[model samples]
Target chain A: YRAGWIHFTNVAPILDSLELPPGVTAITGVPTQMNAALLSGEVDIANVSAVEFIRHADTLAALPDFSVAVLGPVYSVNLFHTCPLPELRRVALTSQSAMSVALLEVLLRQKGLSPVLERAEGTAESLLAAGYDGVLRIGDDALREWYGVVGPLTPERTMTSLPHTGRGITVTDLAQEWFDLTGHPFTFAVWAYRKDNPPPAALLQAMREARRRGIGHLAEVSQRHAEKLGLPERVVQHYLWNFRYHLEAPDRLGLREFADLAVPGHAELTF
Target chain B: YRAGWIHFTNVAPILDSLELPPGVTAITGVPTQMNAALLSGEVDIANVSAVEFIRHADTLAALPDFSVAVLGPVYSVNLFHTCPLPELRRVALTSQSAMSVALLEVLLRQKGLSPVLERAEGTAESLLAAGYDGVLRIGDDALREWYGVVGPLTPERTMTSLPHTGRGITVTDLAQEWFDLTGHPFTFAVWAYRKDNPPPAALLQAMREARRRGIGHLAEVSQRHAEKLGLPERVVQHYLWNFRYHLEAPDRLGLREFADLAVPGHAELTF
Candidate 1:
């Protein structure tokens, strides 16, 4: 398995850390799904978030979390409302993360607006049509699919919280508040090596060195990543600045809170 | 002055109430001073609104306030942010009329957003660039001018209020809100005759009858107006539906509120 070419998910942090021996070709998907498939052992080598690795630790080993990498308070998240409703009124909010949903509901309610909570599933278009006043969505899928139908947005209408130490923050102060409320760090991308075919020490060391190099030359790394991914620099920059990247102490704490709020009856766990 | 034809602004309500003699030719501007210059002395009849007439009331006489013909809330008013600044959370709003500004501010603030007020003068481009987030405007002059620069708007990012009520309601809920907020009914157009030159009774009667006929057949009226005014039917229909009519109560309240707020101390007098 180690003698031939390898493929991995395109998670930026993971791809940035990847290193191959001379004469070995490496393939990665667009940053969207490369990490998930890689750690799943569906591919030779995968770049995944620390959380993902932790979840599947039996099958994978953790990799270095790049210190220089920074995910943003801006991510590709967008919130959309149905038709027109009076401001500060009742609205329905839904998201994939139970913590995100609960936090959003509380934040909106704190602002004197009622948010009806619903599980985020299906497509954003379907959610908007199903009579949701607004939605909190992650990833670029929702933006590409529904921006045309819903039109343009302002930051005030849709806020992204600052990068937090724990559980990732919303696009606004909500994340900061979460950190204040609970002393924990946020969780970002996870990395892991499969147990059955665990990467050799030499390979892991090379990957760590590559990640360190990538982190040292962030601008060059992003440029290369964008070119390799066939994404425009502007778009790549946008995603980089907007998405959550770090797995700092605060982020780790935030992740735990998310699990606590989302996965019911689950005890605290370490990354 | 008595021998020459009088020119009037296309303040629908005011024009609709006027009676003109056979020699008189009723003229309506696109709702601006520029249109008033088009008529020749042979055209003795003119349709003007109370707002405009009040500005030159020293030279004109106030006629009956037509309660039927309505004009707006035509185009949706919106605030566009050029730069992203989370700290500068304040929105600066400008409008020609105090009522328009007040109504918009009330609506926005009621929804939990604060707006700083400014007076809208000059062009829409200037307003947008001057750091003002949005401007509340009315009449064909404002709409035509704004259409050139304003971009597409989504509901969450931007919004328009219902038309005010007095003569008619331009925007349904918006107008109702104006009435509920202000005791004075909105007025769109007011009849005015130059003090120096008055039309014969018979002509005035015919003009009034024509306006009544115009109200009964709005579609035909708008079509005829379009043809006569050399405006596109599509444009006319858009204005008609968006503006509603001049005769409704909501329109009257809008006009009154506009005058009261814009002119201030002059609110005690009715056109």
Candidate 2:
């Protein structure tokens, strides 16, 4: 069995405690890469972005009770800006994540701020310089920005420059925004497998067991990793505390709502 | 005499140690607001965004020795993205700071990538969702994102959501990028006064003395701030350390270089 995995601190809870079954191996990459790998028959199971899973629902089966979600602010996913939300007239979407791009669309549409959208690549300041008023940063990049440090494990550096020269600006947490807007947790990624090649029972059981044990020892795990990664233990603790590793009733509802808003005529998910 | 001030963490070094001179009142606001106040006869001196200073050169006189400059990665100024720089197609410009908008234009133009530009107001994700591939956030918003938190100085919250759902995203530091490109420091803001409303000699002396004392006690000030604001002392130290409170020869060159690229036939600065 092959598992496509995301090697991020966010997923450490599950992976750290995971005891792979016999003959099982893991291929690690970002979510988009994992999604593609799963689609191309490179892997049997993977953690995929929610929108990607929804977009490929005809071919994919999501583990119904497993997802990465946030009930409130997901500090790692944010939209930084120098202006207010409703006044946006144009925007740039990141090409890396389908879910975030789509989520942005749904949120903006609800606000009736249908600005001109385009896909671009570059840093937020560069994009702003290229003429974008807003930019989205997700995962660790967003987290680091929130922490005000640039890290490569060793010799972390603090960020000191200000946008709009420290004027009226804001960082809007996408999950928090989604939660406030819909009163539901926002699901980001979910365990997915091809319907044509479902994983064996042992693999599913291993994943479930991993989540249970990892979540139970989250503080310990977070502490160990924080020291290793040169991150503030407090930040890591808060991050894990707010993230829901196992999809529950509210998480499922949030997933359904996201699918409804972001994916049109979405397909049904199979457990 | 009314003096405009920017009430931000970045400026605390200047304000924290300053003993206001007799009969000198201060009006606090963001950079843009200060710029407006200077223009509307509401302030005798203000810290204004660099481009605003250059744009209205006939009306404004910049203090020859004072500015907010960064020698290297001014972490607070950045562009976060999921796409690469060369691939941007359209972008949104923030309305809050004229300097950043111009800087973005100059940077993108040099890279031979001129995406469609529009003025906008909103969070980065909202703009991205509205159909932009990139956005610009400045000042403390950018700094906070760099630090990974949303704060109102109390009960700070950690964000946990991942954009692109933890995919291959990137955050590009604007000042770092600018430094690499032009081999000069990037100046964000400078003290300026209307040419007709020259500030008193005592006020300028007081301002210089404040900067001198503030920078001298930056470590102590940062420690106090860290505790009061619930921020990491290391982060604050790094922030203050990297920020140049008084413009020097190189900073002047950077300002002149910026004017040449950003402002069309920019007016001469009156010292």
Candidate 3:
């Protein structure tokens, strides 16, 4: 079994508790890389960003009950902007998360704004320093920046000299904004497998059991991962609690709503 | 200090970790009772049902960040029905939850179905046995019934004779339905105090700390309460995770939306 794992703070509850089945070789990467690997059949199964699956629904199928979904105010997946929504003319989005970029697009379009979105390769502050009005970020980088745990922007002279400092920048949690607009939870990623290269029969059941055990031992999982990430255990616990790994009723509705906006002609997702 | 605590499995997270301040007396009861006690000065402050606060907004102010809210699929507040929603003409509601009763009204009214809703004292099966087509249950009774943990409906002879068994019955999670309808987390209850009977300055801070500690110790708190309630520990953990205690941006939006529907002329709540 070539199983993929997402290397992010938010996925701790799922990954930390997973006791891999014998003979399974785990491949770990960011969402986009894992998704690419799965699509190319380099890995049999992995958690792919929701948009990736939507765009490739014909070739891939998701694990029925496994997803990285949040109800609202996901501390990560944020757009740090120097101006309000309508004022910004240019935005830089992290290339790491396709799902958040799609969500950002949907949010901007719904608000009747057409900011020039560009793919960028740097922290939010560095991107802002490079003249973009906004920057979209996700995962560990996002959590550190969002919670003021660590950031390059806070350096004495560099921070004091940022162009937007006087005007004051603002942060918008993309998932929270989506929830506010649609009244539904947002599913960021799902455990996906190539339909043509389906995972072993027992893989899904084993994954489910892993999630159950992980969730039941959230504190322990969170503490261990938080220590590794150099974050406060409580912060990790709170972040994990804000997200759910199972795709239940509300999550499916949210995924459908998101698909409608992000991939208009997309087929309904299947397990 | 006179403070009120809700006596429910969900509230265990808060109550279990709370350390009452010196000279403070705690009053414990169900939500409606606590709301009444707070309003009448029987208790200085309590976690009042959100609707009650809205109805009496002129006199009551909620603690800014404390609330019993859910993004979706709150297992404890549900509507068990024998027929489709529009087909039902009468529905029985548990007398305990004023908030859920009001939500049911909003949901039914929005659908243009004005079912004759009556308050009743009995478990869902008994209410159905007494002839109502649908029944609303909240808190422990609702949790037990929803999860099939306990119910008189399952008695050897009675289980085979229920009218709805032939057609089958459905359960609609009130919070899940609300999220589907509005896309916002549902705020069921909030810590409220009367304007004329304010809580001590340090009380809100204490409560906030209590919540932080409780949430951090969720697994421990959940296990202890699940044992007390004769519920599976995982079920308790899942139930607790489905509900959030803090009233963040999404929760506030949900509360406002609910207030607009449940109490049209209500004043904006103040902390």
**Two-chain DockQ for each candidate model:** 0.01, 0.01, 0.28
* DockQ, 0 to 1 scale, candidate 1: 0.01
Writing each residue's lDDT as its tens digit, candidate 3 over A1-271 gives 7988887877776676676767778988867678778877788888888998899898889877678998777778888888888999998878785567889989988999999988888888788889899889898888767655223343122211223222366767898798778877899988888787777756655665565566666668778877886666666777887886778767888899999998999976997
Candidate of highest lDDT? 3
Model 3 segments more than 4 A misplaced: A83-90, A93-99, A111-119, A149-167, A196-201, B30-33, B86-89, B93-96, B114-122, B126-132, B149-167, B196-201
Error of 1 at B186 (Å): 56
Where model 2 places Cα greater than 4 Å from the true spot, the runs are A149-168, A224-230, B1-271
Candidate 1 lDDT, B92-187, residue by residue in tens: 444444334555555554456664555546554465566554444444444444334342233211212112211211222333344345422345
Per-residue alpha-carbon lDDT of model 2 for A1-271, expressed as tens digits?
7999987778887888888889888888877688789989898899988888888888888876677886656777767666788877667666554458778878888888877777778755567678888777787666665454222222122121112122333667788678658756688889998888777777776776665455545557678767865676645754664566656445677788889888779998656
After TM-score superposition, the amount by which residue A185's alpha carbon in candidate 3 deviates from its true location, in angstroms, is: 2.5
Per-residue lDDT of candidate 3, residues B1-271 (tens digit): 6988876777777777677767778978767677778777889888778888889899998876677888767878888887888888888877656678889889888888888888787888777777887999888778777666222342122211123223255777788789778867789888888887777756655665666666666667778877877776666777786777777777888899999988998997777
lDDT of 1 at B90: 48
Q: Of the candidates shown, which would achieve the greatest TM-score relative to the real structure?
A: 3
Per-residue lDDT of candidate 1, residues A1-271 (tens digit):
3322213212443355566755444554543355545644456555444334444544554433322122112233344554332342333343333324455554454456665556656564566556665556544443333333332333222211112111211123233344344423234345444556645556545554453343233345446645754544433433442233334333444555555554445533423
Chain B alone, candidate 3, TM-score of 0.87
Supply the global lDDT for candidate 3.
0.76
User: A237 in model 2: Cα distance from truth in Å?
Assistant: 0.9
Candidate 2 predicts chain B with a TM-score of 0.83
Ten residues in sequence with the least summed lDDT for candidate 3 chain B: B155-164
